[PDB]
Amino acid sequence: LAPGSSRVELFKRKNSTVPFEESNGTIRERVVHSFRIPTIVNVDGVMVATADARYETSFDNSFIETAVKYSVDDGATWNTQIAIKNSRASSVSRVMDATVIVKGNKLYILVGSFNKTRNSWTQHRDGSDWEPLLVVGEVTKSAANGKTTATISWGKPVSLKPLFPAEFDGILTKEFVGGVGAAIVGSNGNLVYPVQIADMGGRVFTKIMYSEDDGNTWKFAEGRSKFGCSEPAVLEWEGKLIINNRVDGNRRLVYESSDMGKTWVEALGTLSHVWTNSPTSNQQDCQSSFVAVTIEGKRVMLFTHPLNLKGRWMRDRLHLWMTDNQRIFDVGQISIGDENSGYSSVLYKDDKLYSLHEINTNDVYSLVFVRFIGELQLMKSVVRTWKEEDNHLASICTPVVPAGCGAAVPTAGLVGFLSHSANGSVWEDVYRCVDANVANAERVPNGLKFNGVGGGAVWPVARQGQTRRYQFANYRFTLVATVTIDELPKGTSPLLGAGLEGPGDAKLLGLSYDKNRQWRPLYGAAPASPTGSWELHKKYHVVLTMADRQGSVYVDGQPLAGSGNTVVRGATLPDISHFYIGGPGAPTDSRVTVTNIVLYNRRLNSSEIRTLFLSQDMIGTD
Ligand SMILES: *[C@@H]1O[C@H](CO)[C@@H](O)[C@H](O)[C@H]1NC(C)=O
Ligand SMILES: *[C@@H]1O[C@H](CO)[C@@H](O)[C@H](O)[C@H]1NC(C)=O
Ligand SMILES: *[C@@H]1O[C@H](CO)[C@@H](O)[C@H](O)[C@H]1NC(C)=O
Ligand SMILES: *[C@@H]1O[C@H](CO)[C@@H](O)[C@H](O)[C@H]1NC(C)=O
Ligand SMILES: *[C@@H]1O[C@H](CO)[C@@H](O)[C@H](O)[C@H]1NC(C)=O
């Protein structure tokens, strides 16, 4: 948790009481073992915190009801209710795993309802013990002489089981449940629930379930995730749904849909596979909140997830990340120390940031309500850096080309930039997300001159480790740089490129230079053959382009021979380890100077490339 921030144990295990309604109408304040599966939203000015009240144990297959606490004063005071009762059919009847949408003064809560099974939903023989319940709550804010008040009234649950198809694409269905957490109203006003479906064979997958009529009718859109995806979270970004999935035992898959879920496309060029379940990716995953907000005038996405360094369900070290779909910033750790956390929720309201999330000691759970003061401070500062650098680059007057200013310096898809700030061991991302590691370097305007064994910089890709923010490059990238060759090499020496994980010294795409003053572009595993001519100490503009498994290398805005060649074979995505600049076993000593290294998450077109070539003395940070 950041300095300056703080929290309270709002739903306190074996302590906080909820108004249990006995079968005869009588109401008793009953203690609750664990409070799990939180969501905190904002309804017309009132904070609403929704959660599972697991009365007797933290287990999934036990007696559970949906609790709510709400507040009209930003958390100085809360009222408590049980918003959805379970069926009371057996000692394990439960309503659970709330997914929530806020529209106007209304809340739509979808929960899974179970009567008497003792095993988990994906393991059921059929769907006979199960019902997906939709519940509508309505917020009414009055007040009085100087003090606002509020009530929330909860409707009777409605079963959506009759709307569930028996098959999808021939897949026989068994059960479905909301993806957990806060979902959305689309800009077109649709109610949008990401849902998780279990088929008869116990496979899990996700889909979009939505309403164009404020919840009167619902439709299952045609698309879906791969099998293995669960607890999906969704938000809307630039006219598309982004569906961020839990994936136990592997990296998190993210999809985009431009047609209200009818068709899904893996977000390979942005967010898919960036996040995961643990350092090694082979552990059970955890729910994440994924929410779009506007900070300092800019739309960004917030994502929460544990590092889970302990593994299994411990889910320690809950982090918060912020992304504009290009840069990905780790705001930091919001849980405390090495405590076990778990499921979470984040909410930006009246320019204040909060979280409601689990804490777990010995599998007894509480929900803490957190005021992210320091986090928001850091968020605003980085949003300001992003806006300011983008506006500055977009405002440069570039040379008009023969057919007051030419095309703008491209900023769409601009992910990272290494320019003037640097020291002998770190080259700073102007965008403050991913720095490069440096050795044997001395500073020059807008970059670094390398001299010494291993002189160069490593801009980590897979080397980022657990969270892989440059994962997009395995699908497509543009890497740009301005270089001079300072001293002739003995034979061949590296200048710039994308190296690969694995045995060997392999590259996906790159450029080297040789003792005959020729270029040596590297296209995948093919033998380099020299081409062209350069001169010592002359400035060259270099651009590497990778898309559709193809690579091109440009010098001075013109492609070198071999460009357009296939750089990888097969269906498996490349696994880039890093980008190298200079020559970071063999005692490589590349005597070069490189400035203004720019990284894009897409293949720049030919005229964009020319714009960068013509404006290279204009983009540096100084
Ligand atoms: C519940 O927690 C509060 C806050 O610390 C404490 O005052 C109270 O003693 C607790 N009640 C129980 C049952 O221990
Ligand atoms: C309703 O049932 C509960 C269960 O014990 C009991 O405590 C309560 O007093 C009952 N009230 C009435 C009016 O029968
Ligand atoms: C669960 O039990 C309740 C109460 O008896 C009943 O109304 C409901 O239909 C049952 N649900 C299912 C899935 O049959
Ligand atoms: C170098 O500066 C970077 C930021 O430029 C910083 O992380 C580090 O403390 C500095 N010292 C080193 C490692 O040379
Ligand atoms: C390349 O992109 C620029 C900026 O996106 C665009 O205006 C232009 O039409 C594109 N040119 C080509 C070669 O299609």
XYZ file of C-alpha atoms and ligand atoms in Angstrom:
692
model
C 0.000 0.000 0.000
C 1.469 3.393 -0.947
C 2.702 5.913 1.620
C -0.169 8.258 2.426
C -2.824 5.642 1.680
C -4.845 3.759 4.277
C -7.630 1.227 4.812
C -10.193 -0.161 7.280
C -11.440 -3.700 7.659
C -14.953 -2.886 6.410
C -16.376 -6.462 6.236
C -14.597 -8.033 9.181
C -14.474 -11.823 9.453
C -16.142 -13.359 12.582
C -17.056 -9.840 13.701
C -19.169 -7.883 11.243
C -22.804 -8.708 11.540
C -25.456 -8.854 8.804
C -29.270 -8.759 9.238
C -30.180 -12.380 8.624
C -33.875 -12.902 7.863
C -35.132 -16.040 9.500
C -37.698 -18.149 7.593
C -40.536 -16.566 9.585
C -39.658 -13.012 8.742
C -37.856 -12.329 12.026
C -34.470 -10.645 11.571
C -31.362 -11.320 13.590
C -27.898 -9.825 13.484
C -25.761 -12.857 12.640
C -21.969 -13.096 12.626
C -20.311 -14.132 9.384
C -17.229 -16.311 9.047
C -15.770 -14.880 5.822
C -16.677 -12.060 3.428
C -15.465 -12.842 -0.092
C -15.889 -11.809 -3.749
C -16.124 -8.005 -3.370
C -17.318 -5.290 -5.699
C -17.608 -1.634 -4.874
C -19.456 0.713 -7.258
C -20.892 4.233 -7.291
C -24.622 4.714 -7.686
C -25.651 8.281 -8.194
C -23.271 9.476 -5.482
C -23.741 6.531 -3.104
C -20.955 3.943 -2.591
C -22.287 0.410 -2.833
C -20.138 -2.499 -1.649
C -21.425 -5.956 -2.615
C -20.068 -9.223 -1.288
C -20.622 -12.910 -0.479
C -21.535 -13.337 3.207
C -20.162 -16.850 3.814
C -21.815 -17.396 7.154
C -20.232 -20.603 8.393
C -17.057 -21.199 6.426
C -14.996 -19.679 3.578
C -15.820 -22.611 1.338
C -17.583 -22.287 -1.974
C -20.036 -25.048 -1.161
C -21.497 -23.698 2.029
C -24.355 -21.444 3.310
C -24.053 -18.026 1.542
C -26.029 -14.830 0.929
C -25.291 -11.574 -0.843
C -24.451 -8.795 1.559
C -24.363 -5.097 0.800
C -22.999 -2.097 2.634
C -23.658 1.348 1.160
C -22.576 4.835 2.091
C -23.613 8.377 1.267
C -20.513 9.879 2.779
C -17.540 8.382 0.970
C -17.055 5.818 3.698
C -17.407 7.678 6.964
C -20.561 5.686 7.541
C -22.230 2.586 6.148
C -25.589 0.792 6.399
C -25.740 -3.031 6.016
C -28.248 -5.312 4.275
C -28.633 -8.751 2.866
C -29.561 -7.968 -0.735
C -30.221 -11.514 -1.942
C -31.295 -14.407 0.275
C -30.495 -17.915 -0.742
C -33.179 -20.609 -1.226
C -32.843 -22.108 2.259
C -33.184 -25.535 0.696
C -30.271 -27.181 2.582
C -27.350 -26.259 4.764
C -25.301 -25.411 1.669
C -27.839 -23.374 -0.286
C -26.043 -20.323 -1.585
C -26.380 -17.257 -3.774
C -22.856 -16.157 -4.716
C -20.262 -14.584 -7.044
C -21.970 -11.282 -7.744
C -21.475 -9.548 -11.104
C -22.804 -6.036 -11.076
C -23.849 -3.354 -13.520
C -24.831 0.192 -12.540
C -27.259 2.155 -14.715
C -28.785 5.428 -13.545
C -30.012 4.832 -10.019
C -30.241 1.092 -10.613
C -28.056 -1.904 -9.866
C -28.298 -5.150 -11.752
C -26.785 -8.038 -9.818
C -26.322 -11.446 -11.389
C -25.447 -14.319 -9.022
C -25.165 -18.084 -9.210
C -27.775 -19.872 -7.105
C -27.393 -23.361 -5.690
C -29.610 -25.542 -3.480
C -27.711 -28.569 -2.257
C -24.611 -29.710 -4.203
C -21.392 -30.075 -2.356
C -19.067 -30.068 -5.267
C -18.127 -27.260 -7.614
C -20.324 -26.078 -10.469
C -18.032 -27.252 -13.294
C -18.188 -30.720 -11.760
C -21.984 -31.057 -11.666
C -23.652 -33.951 -13.459
C -26.177 -31.510 -14.980
C -27.601 -28.077 -14.193
C -30.470 -29.246 -11.939
C -29.104 -27.812 -8.699
C -28.426 -24.411 -10.345
C -30.062 -21.133 -11.268
C -28.610 -17.852 -12.553
C -30.455 -15.116 -10.642
C -30.810 -11.452 -11.747
C -31.705 -8.955 -9.044
C -32.431 -5.260 -9.457
C -31.745 -2.723 -6.766
C -32.868 0.884 -6.755
C -31.111 3.724 -5.040
C -33.049 6.647 -3.598
C -31.142 9.569 -2.183
C -33.081 11.956 -0.076
C -31.535 13.857 2.829
C -32.697 16.427 5.347
C -31.454 19.612 6.984
C -27.776 19.315 6.122
C -27.477 15.531 5.912
C -28.095 13.412 2.841
C -29.491 9.892 3.374
C -30.137 6.947 1.182
C -32.013 3.708 0.974
C -31.743 0.887 -1.479
C -34.652 -1.331 -2.299
C -34.063 -4.843 -3.684
C -36.456 -6.607 -6.071
C -37.273 -10.293 -6.110
C -34.728 -12.419 -7.907
C -35.558 -13.468 -11.421
C -34.241 -16.645 -12.974
C -32.600 -16.355 -16.379
C -32.374 -20.117 -16.746
C -35.068 -20.270 -19.470
C -32.946 -17.906 -21.635
C -29.937 -20.218 -21.531
C -29.486 -22.139 -24.751
C -29.023 -25.865 -24.460
C -26.184 -25.728 -26.924
C -23.768 -23.304 -28.526
C -22.075 -24.389 -31.740
C -23.114 -27.904 -30.807
C -21.535 -27.486 -27.323
C -24.098 -28.852 -24.849
C -24.521 -26.416 -21.957
C -24.677 -27.111 -18.243
C -24.505 -23.876 -16.293
C -23.424 -20.285 -16.488
C -22.476 -17.495 -14.134
C -21.472 -13.807 -14.380
C -17.748 -13.191 -14.689
C -17.533 -11.647 -11.214
C -17.221 -8.062 -10.305
C -18.172 -4.830 -11.984
C -19.424 -5.033 -15.552
C -20.876 -2.193 -17.666
C -23.422 -0.195 -19.543
C -22.029 0.195 -23.076
C -21.972 3.620 -24.732
C -24.996 2.422 -26.732
C -26.780 1.860 -23.422
C -26.648 -1.990 -23.549
C -26.324 -3.831 -20.253
C -23.179 -5.954 -20.736
C -22.327 -9.023 -18.702
C -19.287 -11.120 -19.435
C -20.250 -14.633 -18.442
C -18.530 -17.969 -17.811
C -20.107 -21.115 -19.187
C -19.518 -24.766 -18.249
C -20.360 -27.351 -20.889
C -21.520 -30.922 -20.190
C -17.906 -32.184 -20.249
C -16.792 -29.735 -17.588
C -15.038 -27.355 -20.019
C -15.200 -23.664 -19.139
C -15.327 -20.749 -21.577
C -16.576 -17.201 -21.738
C -19.186 -15.225 -23.694
C -20.974 -11.879 -23.654
C -24.571 -11.784 -22.345
C -26.309 -8.470 -22.994
C -29.517 -6.475 -22.921
C -30.711 -3.679 -25.244
C -33.776 -3.094 -23.117
C -32.633 -2.405 -19.587
C -32.774 -6.017 -18.525
C -36.136 -7.198 -19.868
C -34.474 -9.546 -22.442
C -30.950 -10.913 -22.769
C -29.009 -12.416 -25.622
C -25.879 -14.564 -25.743
C -23.585 -13.122 -28.362
C -22.104 -15.516 -30.837
C -18.414 -15.318 -30.014
C -16.455 -16.915 -27.173
C -13.028 -17.420 -25.625
C -10.914 -20.502 -25.941
C -11.718 -23.242 -23.474
C -9.914 -22.749 -20.189
C -11.110 -19.162 -19.615
C -13.152 -18.249 -16.556
C -14.193 -15.191 -14.491
C -14.098 -12.791 -17.407
C -14.051 -9.019 -16.796
C -15.116 -6.566 -19.493
C -14.887 -2.852 -20.258
C -15.383 -0.756 -23.373
C -12.504 0.886 -25.121
C -12.655 2.965 -28.311
C -15.817 1.312 -29.562
C -14.801 -2.228 -28.529
C -15.448 -4.634 -25.706
C -12.193 -5.827 -24.112
C -12.595 -9.113 -22.359
C -9.854 -9.957 -19.860
C -10.010 -13.593 -18.729
C -8.915 -15.651 -15.782
C -6.920 -18.656 -17.079
C -5.788 -21.216 -14.518
C -2.454 -22.836 -15.431
C -1.505 -20.386 -18.158
C -1.207 -16.721 -19.168
C -4.259 -14.495 -19.235
C -6.031 -14.270 -22.549
C -7.554 -10.985 -23.624
C -9.985 -10.508 -26.510
C -11.560 -7.582 -28.329
C -15.012 -7.455 -29.973
C -16.253 -4.605 -32.191
C -19.762 -6.051 -32.588
C -21.177 -6.518 -29.089
C -19.497 -9.934 -28.762
C -20.585 -11.517 -32.043
C -16.993 -11.858 -33.024
C -13.892 -12.078 -30.720
C -10.244 -11.503 -31.740
C -7.324 -12.146 -29.454
C -5.681 -8.908 -28.377
C -2.207 -10.067 -29.531
C -0.999 -6.609 -30.336
C -1.893 -5.104 -26.946
C -2.880 -6.941 -23.812
C -3.229 -10.670 -24.356
C -0.748 -12.711 -22.330
C 0.696 -9.673 -20.550
C -0.601 -10.760 -17.148
C -0.577 -14.170 -15.484
C -1.228 -16.222 -12.300
C 2.223 -16.464 -10.719
C 5.905 -16.147 -11.630
C 5.892 -19.535 -13.351
C 2.322 -19.301 -14.894
C 1.355 -22.837 -13.861
C -0.728 -22.007 -10.779
C -4.448 -21.409 -10.331
C -5.420 -17.933 -11.431
C -7.427 -15.282 -9.655
C -10.195 -12.822 -10.461
C -9.216 -9.288 -11.601
C -11.135 -6.066 -11.778
C -10.780 -4.312 -15.139
C -12.321 -0.862 -15.246
C -12.175 2.121 -17.597
C -11.840 5.573 -15.974
C -10.793 9.086 -16.977
C -7.868 10.623 -15.179
C -6.591 14.144 -15.737
C -8.691 14.244 -18.877
C -7.347 11.003 -20.329
C -9.222 7.676 -20.613
C -7.213 4.792 -19.162
C -7.824 1.256 -17.953
C -7.251 -0.018 -14.417
C -6.387 -3.660 -13.789
C -5.830 -5.438 -10.469
C -4.257 -8.802 -9.816
C -2.113 -10.553 -7.194
C 1.534 -11.519 -7.857
C 0.809 -14.770 -6.008
C 4.523 -15.393 -5.247
C 3.312 -17.934 -2.725
C 1.286 -19.866 -5.309
C -1.970 -21.737 -5.281
C -4.818 -19.707 -3.769
C -2.648 -17.569 -1.448
C -2.749 -14.656 -3.927
C -0.345 -12.399 -2.098
C 0.746 -8.961 -3.345
C -2.189 -7.424 -5.048
C -0.972 -4.964 -7.683
C -2.687 -2.207 -9.636
C -1.769 -1.419 -13.227
C -2.860 1.436 -15.465
C -2.826 1.262 -19.225
C -3.881 3.399 -22.146
C -3.757 0.298 -24.436
C -0.190 1.238 -25.393
C 1.868 1.897 -22.268
C 1.425 -0.288 -19.229
C 2.299 1.214 -15.822
C 2.572 -0.758 -12.573
C 1.122 1.702 -10.080
C 2.309 -0.566 -7.328
C 1.261 -2.980 -4.570
C -2.020 -2.111 -2.889
C -2.119 -5.003 -0.380
C 0.207 -4.850 2.631
C 3.538 -6.667 2.822
C 3.326 -10.367 2.150
C -0.230 -10.775 3.331
C -2.539 -13.059 1.278
C -5.145 -11.072 -0.655
C -7.372 -12.459 -3.426
C -10.389 -11.051 -5.287
C -10.531 -7.267 -5.700
C -12.381 -4.207 -6.983
C -11.292 -0.575 -7.749
C -13.456 2.522 -8.005
C -12.783 6.080 -9.052
C -15.399 8.453 -7.694
C -15.408 12.205 -7.297
C -11.728 12.227 -8.127
C -10.869 9.875 -5.323
C -9.561 6.322 -5.805
C -10.477 3.253 -3.680
C -10.242 -0.496 -3.519
C -12.372 -3.187 -1.850
C -10.414 -6.412 -1.681
C -9.907 -9.655 0.159
C -7.412 -10.366 2.895
C -6.904 -13.905 4.018
C -5.432 -15.323 7.172
C -5.785 -19.101 7.614
C -8.606 -19.051 5.025
C -10.834 -16.803 7.029
C -11.485 -13.768 4.866
C -12.205 -10.040 5.369
C -12.737 -7.260 2.810
C -10.639 -4.150 3.335
C -11.805 -0.749 2.030
C -8.854 1.216 0.905
C -8.205 4.827 0.134
C -5.636 4.961 -2.642
C -4.305 8.429 -2.001
C -0.687 7.823 -2.949
C -1.565 5.564 -5.851
C -3.830 8.191 -7.464
C -1.088 10.783 -6.955
C 1.370 8.646 -8.866
C -1.298 7.857 -11.466
C -1.973 11.505 -12.220
C 1.712 12.269 -12.461
C 2.231 9.529 -15.070
C -0.906 10.441 -16.994
C 0.492 13.949 -17.172
C 3.818 12.677 -18.479
C 1.983 10.679 -21.204
C -0.239 13.573 -22.335
C 2.590 16.007 -22.349
C 5.046 13.861 -24.295
C 2.317 12.855 -26.802
C 1.204 16.500 -27.279
C 4.759 17.673 -27.685
C 5.565 15.071 -30.338
C 2.230 15.641 -32.062
C 2.964 19.337 -32.149
C 6.292 19.262 -33.910
C 6.332 20.830 -37.390
C 7.859 18.177 -39.633
C 9.179 18.851 -43.125
C 6.657 19.113 -45.923
C 7.307 16.426 -48.547
C 7.148 17.054 -52.322
C 3.786 15.893 -53.749
C 3.257 24.679 -43.323
C 4.089 21.227 -41.947
C 4.249 17.612 -43.055
C 2.490 14.669 -41.447
C 2.664 14.551 -37.625
C 5.329 12.573 -35.794
C 3.405 9.300 -35.253
C 2.264 8.875 -31.639
C -0.608 6.316 -32.055
C 0.772 3.018 -30.868
C 3.893 4.666 -29.434
C 4.761 2.433 -26.464
C 8.273 3.343 -25.247
C 10.956 6.003 -25.925
C 14.582 6.092 -24.739
C 16.037 9.529 -25.180
C 17.947 12.030 -23.092
C 17.512 10.840 -19.469
C 20.016 8.135 -18.725
C 22.922 7.262 -16.466
C 25.682 4.596 -16.660
C 23.357 1.703 -15.847
C 19.770 2.804 -16.695
C 18.259 4.386 -19.850
C 14.882 5.839 -18.870
C 11.599 5.190 -20.680
C 10.348 8.687 -21.412
C 6.930 7.034 -20.888
C 7.977 5.770 -17.374
C 7.004 2.167 -17.770
C 9.915 0.022 -18.911
C 13.508 1.222 -18.625
C 16.449 -0.322 -20.469
C 19.503 -1.758 -18.623
C 22.840 -0.255 -19.655
C 26.503 -1.092 -19.544
C 29.770 0.458 -20.756
C 28.160 3.672 -21.826
C 28.697 7.367 -21.692
C 26.003 9.975 -22.169
C 25.543 12.085 -25.300
C 22.617 14.325 -26.241
C 19.454 12.168 -26.459
C 21.257 8.882 -25.870
C 24.359 6.837 -25.324
C 27.750 6.082 -26.826
C 29.008 2.566 -26.086
C 32.600 1.679 -25.487
C 33.721 -1.495 -23.766
C 32.940 -5.209 -23.648
C 29.171 -5.664 -23.523
C 28.648 -1.962 -24.302
C 24.943 -1.638 -25.055
C 21.430 -1.551 -23.600
C 18.826 -4.298 -22.946
C 15.184 -3.330 -23.217
C 13.541 -6.340 -21.625
C 10.713 -8.203 -23.293
C 10.309 -11.760 -21.895
C 13.076 -10.641 -19.530
C 10.449 -8.438 -17.842
C 9.617 -11.733 -16.081
C 6.108 -12.461 -14.784
C 4.272 -9.485 -16.195
C 5.201 -9.078 -19.903
C 4.222 -5.597 -20.993
C 6.008 -5.748 -24.301
C 4.398 -9.124 -25.075
C 2.774 -7.378 -28.062
C 6.089 -7.384 -29.961
C 5.925 -11.129 -30.556
C 3.081 -10.360 -32.913
C 4.156 -6.979 -34.379
C 6.479 -4.008 -33.691
C 8.329 -1.055 -35.014
C 11.647 -0.252 -33.388
C 13.319 3.036 -34.402
C 16.710 4.562 -33.659
C 19.274 7.118 -34.814
C 22.825 5.758 -34.977
C 26.433 6.514 -35.890
C 29.107 3.877 -36.274
C 32.050 5.253 -34.288
C 34.773 2.629 -34.993
C 35.118 -0.169 -37.544
C 34.440 -3.628 -36.147
C 36.857 -6.584 -36.435
C 34.358 -8.557 -38.469
C 30.648 -8.207 -37.744
C 29.076 -6.397 -34.737
C 25.450 -5.858 -33.572
C 23.698 -2.523 -33.662
C 19.973 -2.992 -32.988
C 17.484 -5.793 -32.830
C 15.087 -8.257 -31.189
C 16.753 -11.261 -29.570
C 14.994 -14.514 -28.759
C 14.642 -16.679 -25.645
C 16.381 -20.012 -26.012
C 19.670 -21.797 -26.615
C 21.893 -20.060 -29.044
C 22.222 -16.469 -29.915
C 19.117 -16.241 -31.982
C 17.384 -13.117 -33.280
C 13.959 -12.459 -34.625
C 14.924 -9.353 -36.559
C 17.911 -7.084 -36.386
C 20.750 -5.155 -37.987
C 24.482 -5.618 -37.656
C 27.396 -3.859 -39.466
C 30.741 -5.166 -40.702
C 34.454 -4.432 -41.358
C 33.812 -3.771 -45.062
C 31.373 -0.972 -44.114
C 28.361 -2.908 -45.101
C 25.078 -3.514 -43.383
C 24.061 -6.955 -42.215
C 20.297 -7.185 -41.621
C 19.180 -10.304 -39.825
C 15.955 -11.915 -40.880
C 15.071 -14.654 -38.466
C 17.438 -17.575 -38.734
C 18.620 -17.015 -42.328
C 22.335 -16.297 -42.852
C 23.077 -12.591 -43.063
C 24.477 -11.417 -46.380
C 25.959 -7.954 -46.442
C 24.362 -5.247 -48.508
C 24.889 -1.548 -49.163
C 27.368 0.987 -47.821
C 27.753 3.324 -44.833
C 30.490 5.654 -43.561
C 32.005 6.016 -40.068
C 30.650 8.841 -37.973
C 27.754 9.571 -40.270
C 24.260 9.674 -38.711
C 21.836 6.976 -39.923
C 18.151 6.522 -39.223
C 17.307 2.853 -38.483
C 13.889 1.236 -38.396
C 12.941 -2.384 -37.843
C 9.466 -3.540 -38.873
C 7.786 -6.834 -37.887
C 4.209 -7.915 -38.729
C 2.599 -11.007 -40.260
C 5.736 -12.968 -39.354
C 7.611 -10.752 -41.805
C 10.547 -8.371 -41.165
C 11.983 -5.351 -42.926
C 14.979 -3.213 -42.065
C 15.161 0.415 -43.160
C 18.112 2.745 -43.264
C 17.443 6.423 -44.098
C 13.812 5.608 -44.878
C 14.638 3.037 -47.540
C 14.385 -0.728 -47.058
C 17.494 -2.845 -47.331
C 17.727 -5.998 -49.506
C 15.967 -9.064 -48.023
C 13.248 -6.902 -46.521
C 9.797 -8.454 -46.442
C 11.412 -11.821 -45.674
C 9.610 -14.260 -43.322
C 11.175 -14.109 -39.886
C 9.347 -16.857 -38.085
C 7.758 -20.156 -39.200
C 4.665 -21.863 -37.779
C 1.696 -21.018 -35.533
C 3.645 -20.525 -32.303
C 4.284 -16.901 -31.410
C 7.916 -15.902 -31.184
C 9.243 -15.390 -27.661
C 11.381 -12.253 -27.773
C 13.702 -11.904 -24.780
C 14.682 -8.241 -25.329
C 15.594 -5.560 -27.793
C 19.292 -4.887 -27.889
C 20.887 -1.555 -28.729
C 24.640 -1.752 -29.361
C 26.083 -5.071 -28.280
C 25.018 -5.796 -24.666
C 29.705 -15.217 -24.050
C 31.580 -13.616 -26.923
C 33.311 -10.372 -25.919
C 31.243 -8.180 -28.229
C 32.352 -4.478 -28.290
C 30.189 -2.516 -30.700
C 31.500 1.015 -31.035
C 28.356 2.919 -31.806
C 26.271 5.781 -30.499
C 22.518 5.478 -30.405
C 19.898 8.086 -29.634
C 16.106 8.399 -29.549
C 14.969 4.758 -29.604
C 11.300 4.591 -30.249
C 9.001 1.531 -29.820
C 5.574 1.102 -31.471
C 3.044 -1.760 -31.045
C 2.300 -1.890 -34.736
C 4.063 -1.849 -38.071
C 4.463 1.795 -39.082
C 3.640 2.379 -42.765
C 6.138 3.699 -45.368
C 5.174 7.344 -45.014
C 5.147 7.181 -41.224
C 8.636 5.796 -41.469
C 9.590 8.735 -43.764
C 8.133 11.189 -41.312
C 10.312 9.793 -38.568
C 13.305 9.849 -40.887
C 12.706 13.533 -41.717
C 12.044 14.588 -38.146
C 14.789 12.806 -36.303
C 16.531 15.902 -35.027
C 13.203 17.156 -33.697
C 11.955 14.481 -31.286
C 14.585 14.311 -28.537
C 13.907 15.209 -24.903
C 17.213 17.261 -24.963
C -14.780 -6.631 16.386
O -13.772 -5.722 15.983
C -13.766 -4.514 16.721
C -12.702 -3.572 16.170
O -11.440 -3.973 16.661
C -13.473 -4.772 18.190
O -13.720 -3.572 18.884
C -14.390 -5.838 18.761
O -13.911 -6.236 20.030
C -14.469 -7.039 17.829
N -15.457 -7.959 18.347
C -15.114 -9.206 18.694
C -16.195 -10.254 18.581
O -13.978 -9.517 19.085
C -39.164 -16.734 14.240
O -38.269 -17.828 14.252
C -37.105 -17.641 15.046
C -36.255 -18.907 15.007
O -35.811 -19.186 16.321
C -37.452 -17.291 16.491
O -36.295 -17.009 17.243
C -38.306 -16.049 16.467
O -38.557 -15.600 17.783
C -39.560 -16.432 15.691
N -40.551 -15.375 15.822
C -41.876 -15.579 15.889
C -42.774 -14.363 15.847
O -42.367 -16.710 15.973
C -33.973 -24.441 -5.218
O -34.865 -24.581 -4.132
C -35.872 -23.581 -4.143
C -36.660 -23.574 -2.832
O -37.273 -24.825 -2.636
C -36.774 -23.750 -5.374
O -37.721 -22.695 -5.440
C -35.898 -23.678 -6.613
O -36.635 -23.888 -7.802
C -34.741 -24.663 -6.508
N -33.865 -24.399 -7.623
C -33.690 -25.281 -8.602
C -32.457 -25.117 -9.433
O -34.480 -26.197 -8.833
C 20.525 5.553 -12.643
O 19.366 6.287 -12.841
C 18.245 5.439 -12.808
C 17.174 6.305 -13.420
O 17.881 7.003 -14.435
C 17.957 4.937 -11.391
O 17.090 3.805 -11.411
C 19.252 4.559 -10.667
O 19.046 4.760 -9.286
C 20.500 5.330 -11.134
N 21.735 4.698 -10.687
C 22.361 3.719 -11.358
C 21.858 2.314 -11.118
O 23.310 3.921 -12.127
C 0.013 5.640 -43.365
O -0.446 6.139 -42.131
C -0.667 7.512 -42.194
C -0.892 7.902 -40.763
O -1.637 6.834 -40.220
C -1.929 7.676 -43.037
O -2.407 9.000 -43.063
C -1.638 7.258 -44.461
O -2.833 7.325 -45.231
C -1.034 5.858 -44.462
N -0.379 5.705 -45.737
C -0.396 4.582 -46.445
C 0.923 4.274 -47.110
O -1.396 3.849 -46.551
